[PDB]
Amino acid sequence: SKYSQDVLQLLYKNKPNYISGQSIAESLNISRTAVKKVIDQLKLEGCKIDSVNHKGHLLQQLPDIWYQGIIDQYTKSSALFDFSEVYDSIDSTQLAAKKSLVGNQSSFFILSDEQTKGRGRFNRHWSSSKGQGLWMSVVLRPNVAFSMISKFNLFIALGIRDAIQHFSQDEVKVKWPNDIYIDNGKVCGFLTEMVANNDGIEAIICGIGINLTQQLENFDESIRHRATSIQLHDKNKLDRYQFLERLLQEIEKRYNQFLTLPFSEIREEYIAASNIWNRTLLFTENDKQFKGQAIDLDYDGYLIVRDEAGESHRLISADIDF
């Protein structure tokens, strides 16, 4: 009903204490009995709620569904995010964000359980299954020149990798400039875009797609040997609210780093975290394709590459295959 999110919100807020039906009824000004029906419906959708006579209700565990009422708590206590929008299904969080940023200076993010028109780079398809991943767009408002886009993209990467690392017992590496791998499986793809003019960035929009709970059986045959999910590398059930919380904590740490530090302070760390060294890489640029070795990441974030013909290149971005 109308009141599901509000009831869920009260339950999240009151953890680890129990609140009574009666007390929830008073808050929202509805009947005890409507409170019971709302609570029955949440259990039926897979909320795990302990109901104890004389004590009331305790939210123990959420299902793999995003709830606006819970996300609203994440933004209230956030110093960086003014608000969020949550969707069950939508064309793309990235389209939605590019539409919502117009005409304001808010910082916010958009999450959706499924995307029907998920896009990565160069208009490629990004598989966004219902219930199985974090499909998110983040909009921020750095006072910086439009050339700083690349450097933002370097910082955010370490933020995402760190948040996935906390949950996998296997190594999580960055594949510059736009993906996160565990072994040979891409677990995340992200993409940083901007609205800007000669005078400055108007918004950064970072699209982040993270495979959370797919089994191998869940990926299309076409990508199944090069894709993985956090669950496939975590011995405990992966909890999506716990992940989101850590993801937002890291994004904010790295965003403040971005505003305050040169790339040179994180370069070594980025280097050590990267899986592009010591192996043959395939590069695509429009017509050309070529092979190459990543030699180095320079102090401004360019990849130094020696191609198979011995020519050296200095790249602000690329798309690489392994």
Contacts to ligand BTX by CB under 6 A: 92-94, 115, 118-121, 124, 126-128, 135-137, 178-179, 186, 189-191, 207-209, 211, 223, 227
Binding partner selected for residue 287 from its own copies, ligand BTX, none, CB under the kind-specific 5 to 8 Å limit: none
SS3 state of residue 317: coil
Q: 78 to 117, contacts with its own copies by CB under 8 A?
A: 91-92, 95, 98-99, 102-103
Q: Which is nearer to ligand BTX, 92 or 165 (CB)?
A: 92
Q: Which is nearer to ligand BTX, 3 or 146 (CB)?
A: 146
Q: Which is nearer to its own copies, 127 or 192 (CB)?
A: 192
Token pair 């569904």: residue: 65
Torsion of CA 178, 136, 236, 275, to 10 degrees: 0
Chain breaks in the chain (C to N over 2.5 A) after: none
Interface pattern 189-228 for its own copies (x via CB under 8 A): --xxxxxxxxx--x--------------------------
Torsion of CA 266, 272, 278, 283, to 10 degrees: -40
Binding partner selected for residue 127 from its own copies, ligand BTX, none, CB under the kind-specific 5 to 8 Å limit: ligand BTX
Q: Are strands 108-115 and 83-90 parallel, antiparallel or unpaired?
A: parallel
Q: Which residues contact 156 (CB under 8 A, 6 or more apart)?
A: 190, 192, 206, 251, 254, 255, 258
* Residue closest to 58 by CA, chosen among 109, 7, 120: 7
Binding partner selected for residue 309 from its own copies, ligand BTX, none, CB under the kind-specific 5 to 8 Å limit: none
Q: Which is nearer to its own copies, 177 or 209 (CB)?
A: 177
Least CB distance to its own copies at residue 262 (A):
19
How far is the C-alpha of 258 from the C-alpha of 151, rounded, in Å?
8
Least CB distance to its own copies at residue 274 (A):
17
